[PDB]
Design a protein around this ligand. Structure first.
Ligand SMILES: [Mg+2]
Ligand SMILES: [Zn+2]
Ligand SMILES: [Zn+2]
Ligand SMILES: [Zn+2]
Lengths: 171, 97, 112, 268, 107, 84, 178, 557
DNA sequence: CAGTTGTGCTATGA
DNA sequence: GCACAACTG
């Protein structure tokens, strides 16, 4: 998991910017668009690596308007979750239906039913928790989750997780 | 006024590629469509506002491009589809030469 | 080759008859085009319009619908190299002004 | 039909004439690579006349006292008589002009001299004269080497094709074959000195202009010769008004590659 | 090369491709009376070698498709016993250039 | 496939079509409030500025000359001969 | 316009099959083992353990902050506040994702020092496992070969029990303190 | 104009032609297209969710599209479908369908001839998709029996068993829209003498085509992804949205449906008869009767001008306009709407020759200059001029008609309450009047050569005629006996340049047609030039001075 | 192999 | 209003 990928974006510049701070503006636009971006193809496009060596290439003049299109070849850190992947995250939200574990830029949700029977919901607690004979899972809690599946929603990826199997759960 | 075939030829003869385009597009027909990248047809349901893209039947909500063709061409294409002919429009190549 | 030579002589003569002068090259180019294919090709739908050029281009002269029907059944692929295609497509054709591409170089842009 | 048959035909950046399939139609446009707008009917001098008057107009024998160039013609004249080394150059000059003559007579069998070619050499010379106020009385300051070799050099710079390889290089040689005959015909030693009465500068200037004028005369890649040629044949057909079928019906006959034609005939 | 007076039976004519790699040519005596290659209109055709052809296509960035053609059965193609794929160089005298080189590929 | 500089074999001179496209492009750009690499010595017409830019060879553009096979030779306006 | 890759495949009309993604190491087409870099060269996948990932991002932003100042010429809780500052100087701010990532990475990283991380990287990139498996052994803290082999299920027959357990023992020793 | 769309803007690089697989037709379909009734929710105006908008495109101009929201100028229209009650041939392919049957076994779907026949393997070699199919046909059409055992490539004594099926092959003849076979049979080696005669059903030919091997049909002209033979037979009919067949809506309470909308309602009608007919008590003859009719309506909708004469006519005698007809050249999509268009920023009037104009200029009547517009971007170099032109307005000559903001929204100076109090911002466009010295395309039809369309300098003049220099008469073929000429105004700085740099009158002077100049001194000037230049002709001081002054470049000497 | 029927076009703008 | 083109006899 957590990958480095060799991507490329196609930015179109308006003639007004055909000055010297051209490469500068293009590089910035790249970060504007691509950094913090989230696709399903590659997942979360987190940090654009090697700013100094971003390959601008030559920009082709688009015919009837005056603009120029560039293929900006780059390299960056991505995070694309997978089904069956084991993650170690921190509880954020927790309800009568289950808790939502924060794993990097993405949240994994554990269903009351994807946890062992021994773990029961406790409404009568500040903050709300899940209690067992031994373990107590509330907000700040750190958990080992098995990603059961992912849902590629727009500007994010969500997932459902299990803590029911072995070596999984509270850590 | 008609910028007919004969007048088209004259521009071709002049090598006035862009004047010719402007004459056929911007000064007439010019229209914008959304085509799918898988099936080369205008099947795309561009809800450009909610920024939703879709081409159901292709399940493609990703591989979509916008194109500027004369409305007459767009028509011709829909007319060919009505005749069971697929005028698959693609934005890249696979040939060389 | 002799057929080409004779074809020119015969073409030239129709123009020369009416006491007109046409530059060699033009007539040569026509004659050449009929000739190139291997034998004598007509300037009719049975002639040029039958070659392996882009379906869209060919449909623009005489067998329009028939040409387009064949295209589908034989899964023809138009190169989009022809003038006509670009004209149909509302694209800048690779003609004179469109025979090359133009690019900004950020190297020369910084030099000036 | 003419326009539709040729629409996609244009000159490419390799000086080739191709279509939408990139199939070669003419290897070099018009067989010469020249733009039709830059051509004028010029006289290929070398072609006609007696072998005697060709000799009178061209031959320079610095070894014969009656067939040398008079010191009246160039400063070098008096010191030029008997110079064996230079005679080798003039022998080449002559041998080439004779070669040229036989070649032209193979090309144009009828002996027609007037043909449309680039660069009006007559006009260049004319301007050189009014430009430099050429004194027809005073001798030239040109060397045989100046004239002989200067024309030899100019020839190498009449660039149509460019590639560095036998194939392309030979294509270039071929393309410029006729224009050179014209150039060699007009810029021969005797003509330059006795007729034109050119000075070193005036001559260098003539050569330099021929170069630019020629280079300027070549076709532009992108030139849409398809439509051009079609309109060039079509437009005069519009203007149209033994008894062998001619005019529009024969042209119809021709284009249609008609089998059962009106006036079949043999010229035995 | 078999020079035949009037005709060759279709029985015998089917035995022409029988012995490869060796090739057999049939020529009707009547055609050969006059050498067509000697005509005002008939230019020099030159058979290019495997190496020569390879160069022509290299130098012009060609596919064999792009080359102008000569049919196998073309009078001059027959005289030179040209095979499919073989290329010829044609030298014509130009009223434009003096000398012009065309190229034809066999069909 | 991109023919390297040392191998380029197209004219070293700028075509009529090239010039027309360069002048056209720069004028369109100049008019689109783009930066001008010349002293407008009272110039106001984007074409007249584009012309001045070409005359002083301060146009930052490259002509991508395509060959029938697909390959290309890139040439700078700076380097092209404008004898036209 | 969205982002594109090195991979070129021309899937003409042939929409689907779009294969399931599981650690049966059947990752994406995009996340194949055998891949291409911007320079056309073939190059094996790059997967990172949290800390390998932490130092990469940190370093990237550090050299970026240098370039942003160049052109302008004319302890975990203590590392958390430090990064939160670096982000404010190099990131678009609106990138709440990298902010959350950096926090997560700071808090869940097993090895603080580059030297330490390099040793881990060497120790693991010798087993000849898949970049993903190698990442998980560096990311997930395991004590049994069974702990490991259950959580990184792909491992199964690929490595020996005792071999894996030796590696775990070594990773436990390299485990940077707090 | 049209709204911003995120979607990456590209150009069509390739056009991959093919045929619709019903599966696709259904998949791309936003509706099906169940009832011939156009609209009127039973007499109640609004489209029926059943034909022409059961999601589809949209009528009303008001009221957005049901699937996408966009509306009229934006919504391209969305395809529907009708599931046909029985398979039908596509008119355009009837003969290919026949030629394909004539090349394959009409029982097992195996190519009649194969790798074993020397002439067949010779034809099978043909690289060209089309010629290869043609060569195959000429060979397989003769073959009348599906062979099971063929004489081996080494020896004809010990024959080899190739593909199965021994069935005899029919002799196919087209009885217009119907393909009828004539199997010779066998009967004591004699017969026929009296053959077996039956119509080949669409469905049987369909099953035969579905059994043709990928390799077998790929040897034929066909493609396994884009054009399988079975797709020449129509099972699922795509419904083209309203933009293809619009409803010309006069007033509020009145219809006006397209021809295609009627022919579709007929296909619809014919289909429901066939559907209920077969589902219920099938009187079998009435089944082949309603079928043949649907075959007719699907045929006529595509092509109407067929061999077997009955033209499908609308009750008015008027034959119903086929989609095929819509495309057929000089007028009709290709030739009429695409190789040529009627264009905006164009003008036409009577011409008259002026000796006071310059060769490259053109006299443009004020009213024309007042209509025609150049879209000019607000730049520091022009800002002030453009403001005065805006101030001047649409009625004064040097003026303007519209101010276009960055917002893309047009300010009509003609009416706008802020037409006076308006301040231009860099980047806006002022659509100004055509002014003196603008490059314009001027042309005289026919337009046989390049020179019949040339670029000229504007000169805004009074009176209603286009004025031109007499020496530019010949290139155009103009006479002032009542000729009219057309004018085109470029809208881009790029476009103007193309005209001024490539097609200007001074450039066109020496023509490549005959390597000579195509313009010279004419008429009065020619007649008079001889007259002035005789040796006998002398001029006294007084007139010499006017004659000099008149030459605009004269050195004052 | 030859005979008849079969097919698709017929200037540009007002 | 004609000029091949292709199927059938
Ligand atoms: Mg008139
Ligand atoms: Zn699709
Ligand atoms: Zn819609
Ligand atoms: Zn069978």
């Amino acid at each position: 998991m957590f990958f480095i990928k060799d991507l490329s974006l196609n930015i179109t510049l308006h003639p007004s910017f055909f000055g010297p701070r051209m490469k500068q503006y293009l590089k910035t636009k790249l970060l504007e668009e691509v950094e913090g971006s989230c696709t399903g193809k590659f997942g979360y496009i987190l940090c654009v690596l090697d700013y100094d060596n971003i390959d601008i290439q030559r920009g082709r003049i688009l015919p009837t308007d005056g603009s120029a299109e560039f293929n900006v070849k780059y390299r960056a850190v991505v995070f694309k979750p997978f089904k069956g992947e084991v993650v170690d995250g921190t509880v954020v939200s927790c309800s009568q239906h289950g808790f939502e574990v924060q794993v990097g830029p993405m949240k994994v949700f554990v269903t009351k039913h994807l946890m062992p029977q021994d773990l029961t919901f406790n409404a009568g607690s500040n903050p709300p928790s899940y209690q067992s004979s031994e373990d107590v899972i509330t907000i700040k809690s750190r958990i080992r989750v098995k990603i059961e599946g992912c849902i590629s929603q727009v500007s994010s990826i969500h997932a459902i997780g299990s803590i029911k199997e072995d070596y999984l759960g509270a850590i | 006024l008609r910028f007919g075939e004969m007048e088209r030829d004259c521009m071709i003869a002049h090598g006035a590629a862009s004047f010719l385009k402007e004459r056929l597009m911007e000064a007439s027909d010019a229209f914008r469509v959304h085509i799918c990248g898988i099936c080369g047809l205008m099947t795309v349901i561009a809800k450009l506002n909610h920024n939703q893209f879709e081409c159901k039947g292709c399940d493609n909500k990703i591989d979509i491009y916008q194109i500027h063709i004369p409305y007459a061409a767009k028509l011709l294409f829909q007319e060919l589809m009505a005749m069971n002919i697929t005028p698959r429009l693609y934005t890249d190549r696979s040939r060389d030469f | 080759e002799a057929g080409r030579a004779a074809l020119y002589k015969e073409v030239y003569n129709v123009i020369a008859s009416d006491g007109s002068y046409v530059n060699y090259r033009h007539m040569a180019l026509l004659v050449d085009v009929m000739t190139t294919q291997g034998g004598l090709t007509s300037v009719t739908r049975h002639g040029f319009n039958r070659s392996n050029t882009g379906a869209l281009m060919r449909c623009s002269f005489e067998e329009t619908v028939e040409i387009l029907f064949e295209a589908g059944a034989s899964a023809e692929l138009d190169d989009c190299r022809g003038v006509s295609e670009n004209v149909i497509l509302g694209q800048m054709a690779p003609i004179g002004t469109g025979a090359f591409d133009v690019m900004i170089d950020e190297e020369s842009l910084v030099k000036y | 039909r003419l326009v539709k048959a040729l629409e996609d035909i244009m000159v490419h950046y390799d000086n080739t004439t191709r279509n939408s399939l990139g199939n070669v139609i003419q290897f070099i446009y018009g067989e010469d690579g020249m733009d039709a707008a830059h051509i004028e009917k010029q006289s290929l001098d070398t072609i006609g006349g007696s072998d005697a008057a060709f000799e009178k107009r061209y031959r320079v024998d610095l070894l014969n006292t009656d067939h040398t160039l008079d010191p009246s013609l160039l400063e070098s004249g008096s010191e030029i008589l008997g110079d064996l080394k230079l005679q080798v150059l003039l022998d080449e000059e002559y041998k080439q002009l004779v070669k040229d003559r036989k070649f032209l007579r193979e090309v144009f069998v009828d002996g027609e001299a007037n043909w449309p070619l680039p660069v009006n050499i007559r006009r260049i010379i004319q301007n050189a004269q009014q430009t430099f106020h050429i004194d027809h009385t005073k001798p030239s300051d040109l060397t045989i080497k100046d004239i002989v070799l200067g024309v030899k050099d100019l020839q190498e710079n009449l660039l149509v094709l460019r590639g560095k390889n036998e194939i392309i290089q030979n294509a270039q040689r071929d393309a410029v074959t006729l224009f050179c005959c014209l150039l060699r015909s007009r810029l021969a030693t005797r003509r330059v000195l006795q007729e034109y009465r050119l000075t070193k500068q005036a001559f260098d200037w003539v050569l330099s202009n021929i170069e630019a004028q020629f280079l300027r005369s070549v076709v532009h890649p992108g030139e849409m010769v398809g439509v051009l040629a079609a309109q060039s044949i079509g437009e005069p057909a519009t203007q149209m008004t033994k008894k062998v079928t001619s005019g529009v019906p024969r042209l119809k006959e021709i284009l249609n590659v008609a089998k059962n034609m009106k006036t079949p005939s043999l010229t035995v | 090369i078999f020079v035949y007076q009037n005709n060759i039976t279709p029985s015998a004519m089917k035995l022409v491709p029988s012995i490869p790699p060796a090739t057999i040519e049939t020529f009707n005596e009547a055609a050969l009376v006059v050498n067509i290659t000697h005509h005002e209109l008939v230019p020099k055709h030159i058979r290019l070698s495997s190496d020569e052809k390879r160069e022509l296509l290299k130098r012009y960035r060609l596919k064999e498709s792009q080359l102008p053609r000569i049919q196998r059965a073309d009078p001059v193609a027959l005289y030179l016993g040209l095979k499919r794929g073989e290329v010829v160089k044609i030298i014509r005298k130009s009223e434009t250039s003096g000398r012009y080189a065309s190229y034809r590929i066999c069909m | 496939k991109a023919i390297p500089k040392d191998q380029r074999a197209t004219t070293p001179y700028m075509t009529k079509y090239e010039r027309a496209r360069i002048l056209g492009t720069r004028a369109l750009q100049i008019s689109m409030n783009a930066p001008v690499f010349v002293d407008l010595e009272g110039e106001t017409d984007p074409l007249r500025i584009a012309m001045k830019e070409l005359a002083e060879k301060k146009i930052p553009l490259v002509i991508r000359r395509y060959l029938p096979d697909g390959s290309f030779e890139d040439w700078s306006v700076e380097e092209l001969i404008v004898d036209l | 316009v969205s982002t594109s890759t090195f991979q070129t495949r021309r899937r003409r009309l042939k929409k689907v099959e779009e294969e399931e993604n599981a650690a049966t190491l059947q990752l994406g087409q995009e996340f194949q083992l055998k891949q291409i870099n911007h320079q056309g060269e073939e190059e094996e996948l790059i997967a990172l353990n949290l800390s390998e990932a932490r130092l990469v991002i940190k370093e990237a932003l550090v050299e970026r902050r240098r370039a942003f100042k160049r052109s302008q010429k004319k302890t975990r809780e203590k590392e958390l506040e430090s990064i939160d500052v670096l982000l404010e100087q190099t990131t678009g701010g609106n990138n709440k994702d990298l902010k959350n990532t950096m926090q997560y990475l700071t808090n869940f990283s097993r090895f603080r020092d580059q030297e330490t991380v390099g040793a881990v990287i060497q120790l693991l990139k010798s087993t000849g496992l898949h970049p993903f498996e190698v990442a998980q052994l560096g990311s997930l803290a395991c004590d049994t070969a069974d702990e490991a082999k259950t959580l990184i299920p792909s491992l199964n027959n690929k490595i020996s029990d005792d071999e894996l357990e030796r590696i775990l023992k070594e990773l436990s020793n390299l485990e940077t303190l707090y | 104009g049209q709204q911003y769309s995120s979607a990456p803007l590209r150009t069509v690089k390739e056009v991959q032609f093919g045929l619709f697989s019903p599966e696709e037709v259904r998949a791309i379909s936003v509706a099906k297209i169940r009832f011939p009734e156009t609209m009127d929710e039973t007499q109640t105006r609004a489209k029926i969710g059943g034909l022409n908008d059961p999601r589809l495109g949209s009528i009303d101009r008001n009221l957005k599209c049901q699937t996408c929201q966009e509306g009229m100028n934006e919504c391209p229209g969305h395809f529907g479908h009708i599931d046909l009650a029985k398979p039908v041939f596509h008119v355009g392919f009837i003969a290919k369908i026949k030629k394909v049957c004539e090349c394959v076994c009409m029982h097992c779907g195996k190519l009649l001839l194969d790798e074993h026949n020397e002439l067949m393997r010779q034809a099978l070699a043909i690289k060209d998709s089309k010629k290869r199919f043609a060569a195959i046909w000429t060979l397989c059409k003769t073959k009348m029996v599906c062979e099971t055992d063929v004489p081996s490539e080494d020896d004809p004594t010990q024959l080899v068993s190739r593909g199965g099926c021994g069935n005899t092959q029919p002799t196919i003849r087209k009885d217009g829209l119907k393909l009828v076979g004539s199997w010779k049979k066998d009967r004591a080696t004699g017969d026929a003498d009296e053959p077996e005669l039956r119509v080949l059903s669409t469905e049987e030919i369909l099953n035969i085509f579905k059994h043709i091997s990928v390799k077998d049909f790929t040897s034929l002209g066909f493609n396994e992804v884009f054009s399988r033979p079975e797709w020449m037979i129509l099972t699922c009919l795509p419904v083209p949205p309203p933009p293809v067949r619009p409803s010309i809506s006069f007033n509020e309470s009145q219809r006006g449906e397209d021809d295609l909308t009627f022919k579709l309602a007929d296909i619809l009608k014919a289909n429901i008869s066939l559907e209920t007919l077969e589902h219920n008590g099938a009187p079998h003859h009435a089944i082949e009767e309603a079928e043949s009719l649907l075959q007719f309506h699907v045929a006529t909708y595509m092509d109407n001008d067929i061999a077997g004469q009955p033209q499908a006519l609308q009750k008015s005698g008027r034959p119903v306009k086929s989609i095929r007809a819509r495309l057929k050249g000089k007028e009709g999509r290709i030739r009429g709407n695409l190789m040529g268009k009627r264009v905006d920023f164009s003008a036409r009037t009577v011409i008259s020759g002026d000796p006071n104009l310059e060769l490259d200029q053109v006299g443009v009547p004020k009213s024309i200059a007042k209509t025609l517009t150049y879209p000019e971007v607000v730049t520091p170099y022009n800002i002030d001029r453009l403001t005065q032109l805006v101030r001047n307005g649409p009625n004064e000559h040097p003026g303007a008609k519209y101010v276009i903001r960055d917002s893309g929204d047009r300010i009509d100076l003609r009416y706008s309450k802020r037409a006076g109090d308006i301040q231009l911002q860099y980047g806006w466009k002022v659509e100004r009047h055509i002014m003196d010295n603008d490059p314009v395309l001027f042309n005289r039809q026919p337009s046989l050569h390049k020179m019949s369309m040339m670029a000229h300098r504007v000169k805004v003049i009074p009176y209603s005629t286009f004025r031109l220099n007499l020496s530019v008469t010949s290139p155009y073929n103009a006479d002032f006996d009542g000729d009219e000429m057309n004018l085109h105004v470029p809208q881009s700085e790029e476009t103007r340049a193309e005209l001024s740099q490539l097609c200007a009158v001074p450039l066109q002077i020496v023509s490549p047609q005959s390597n000579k100049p195509c313009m010279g001194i004419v008429q009065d000037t020619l007649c008079g030039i001889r007259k002035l230049t005789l040796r006998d002709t002398f001029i006294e001081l007084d007139q010499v001075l006017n004659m000099l002054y008149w030459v605009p470049d004269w050195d004052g000497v």
